[PDB]
Amino acid sequence: KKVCYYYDGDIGNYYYGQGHPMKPHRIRMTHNLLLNYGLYRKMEIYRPHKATAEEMTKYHSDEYIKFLRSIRPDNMSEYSKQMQRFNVGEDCPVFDGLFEFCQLSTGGSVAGAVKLNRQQTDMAVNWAGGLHHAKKSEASGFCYVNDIVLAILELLKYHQRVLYIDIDIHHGDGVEEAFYTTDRVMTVSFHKYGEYFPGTGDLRDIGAGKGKYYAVNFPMRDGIDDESYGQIFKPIISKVMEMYQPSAVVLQCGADSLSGDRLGCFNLTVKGHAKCVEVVKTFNLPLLMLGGGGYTIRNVARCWTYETAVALDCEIPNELPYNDYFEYFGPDFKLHISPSNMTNQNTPEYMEKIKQRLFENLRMLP
Ligand SMILES: N#Cc1cccnc1N1CCN(C(=O)[C@H]2C[C@@H](c3ccccc3)CN2)CC1
Ligand SMILES: [Ca+2]
Ligand code: NA
Ligand SMILES: [Zn+2]
Numbered sequence: 161k162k163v164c165y166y167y168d169g170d171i172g173n174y175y176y177g178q179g180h181p182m183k184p185h186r187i188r189m190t191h192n193l194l195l196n197y198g199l200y201r202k203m204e205i206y207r208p209h210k211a212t213a214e215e216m217t218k219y220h221s222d223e224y225i226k227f228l229r230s231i232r233p234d235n236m237s238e239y240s241k242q243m244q245r246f247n248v249g250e251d252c253p254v255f256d257g258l259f260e261f262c263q264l265s266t267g268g269s270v271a272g273a274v275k276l277n278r279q280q281t282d283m284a285v286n287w288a289g290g291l292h293h294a295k296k297s298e299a300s301g302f303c304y305v306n307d308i309v310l311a312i313l314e315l316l317k318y319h320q321r322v323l324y325i326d327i328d329i330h331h332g333d334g335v336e337e338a339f340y341t342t343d344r345v346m347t348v349s350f351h352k353y354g355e356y357f358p359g360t361g362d363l364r365d366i367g368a369g370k371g372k373y374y375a376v377n378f379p380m381r382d383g384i385d386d387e388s389y390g391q392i393f394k395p396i397i398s399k400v401m402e403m404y405q406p407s408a409v410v411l412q413c414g415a416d417s418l419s420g421d422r423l424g425c426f427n428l429t430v431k432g433h434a435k436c437v438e439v440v441k442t443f444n445l446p447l448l449m450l451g452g453g454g455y456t457i458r459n460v461a462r463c464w465t466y467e468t469a470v471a472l473d474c475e476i477p478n479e480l481p482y483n484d485y486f487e488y489f490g491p492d493f494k495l496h497i498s499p500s501n502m503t504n505q506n507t508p509e510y511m512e513k514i515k516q517r518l519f520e521n522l523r524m525l526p
Pocket of ligand 4: 328329330416452453
């Protein structure tokens with residue numbers, strides 16, 4: 161099984177601003193770690209192209225993309241009304257190179273999708289992607305351009321049915337919304353729910369019109385652990401595969417669902433998270449693996465390094481190799497992480513009752 165992987169050496173140089181939790185540097189740390197494990201010997205590594213306005217407007221509105229192409233720190237005063245309209249300037253800040261960042265993020269995802277469509281690879285990886293909150297005409301949740309939606313649109317040229325799976329701790333609302341009224345994409349999100357960003361992803365949100373029953377949401381509480389997550393992920397995705405029979409899969413691998421994350425409150429290890437990748441691989445479908453959140457950046461590097469190894473069917477040692485960020489991995493300098501003692505608020509009965517409701521909804525498919 162062939163793996164192609166996208167990385168631009170400048171991606172880690174884009175900076176959201178002092179105090180902003182989103183740190184693109186984590187992608188560079190990921191790259192450096194997997195280079196030092198030698199995983200480059202086993203996969204094709206490509207620099208993404210800069211996605212064009214033409215590519216982005218396959219989903220996004222022309223006026224929103226023109227604005228993103230225009231806005232800079234130095235001209236914000238002139239654009240204050242557009243900033244309000246497009247939701248840029250606070251949680252989605254204006255920063256130097258914002259548009260180029262969007263171009264490289266998106267380029268990796270669309271390029272991966274083209275490679276899968278051309279049957280030139282079995283798996284494509286873009287850790288700079290996964291920006292699941294961006295909306296047709298507005299930024300949201302640190303996300304400006306929805307690389308995932310654009311990648312899925314590319315797959316839909318060749319594939320009648322595309323499955324999207326999202327294991328970020330946040331609901332993938334921008335992706336769900338884009339495809340909410342179609343049966344040609346089934347969206348499956350596992351996420352923290354209960355007055356938590358973005359507020360959507362209720363398990364009663366099942367899609368609308370032709371898309372009714374083609375959106376699947378598994379709302380979870382704080383503290384979910386590897387065993388609990390594993391016992392619902394494999395059965396739900398197995399049932400989705402049996403009922404939906406997709407011909408391509410997109411997996412958002414947001415790492416803010418790991419134990420110890422600065423913003424998230426789940427308790428997964430890197431092994432528990434990566435088990436999701438292993439499960440999806442067993443179906444032998446063309447697979448686009450994307451990044452996502454993650455705010456404890458040493459753990460993001462560990463998670464995506466290990467998930468790359470999983471894609472390559474390669475075990476790698478727990479002892480970390482020397483690397484340019486080695487001091488970030490103290491005090492233990494291991495790849496794998498331990499869970500915390502936080503309480504798991506997801507009772508066995510809760511997990512099984514929700515799974516049973518999702519099974520009933522999946523049985524509604526043709
Ligand atoms: N704005 C906000 C906000 C407000 C209040 C409370 N929380 C807020 N945040 C919490 C953190 N968020 C995420 O982790 C999202 C972002 C997404 C991403 C992936 C790759 C690159 C860039 C972004 C992954 N999931 C966004 C929303
Ligand atoms: Ca999710
Ligand atoms: Na749908
Ligand atoms: Zn997130």
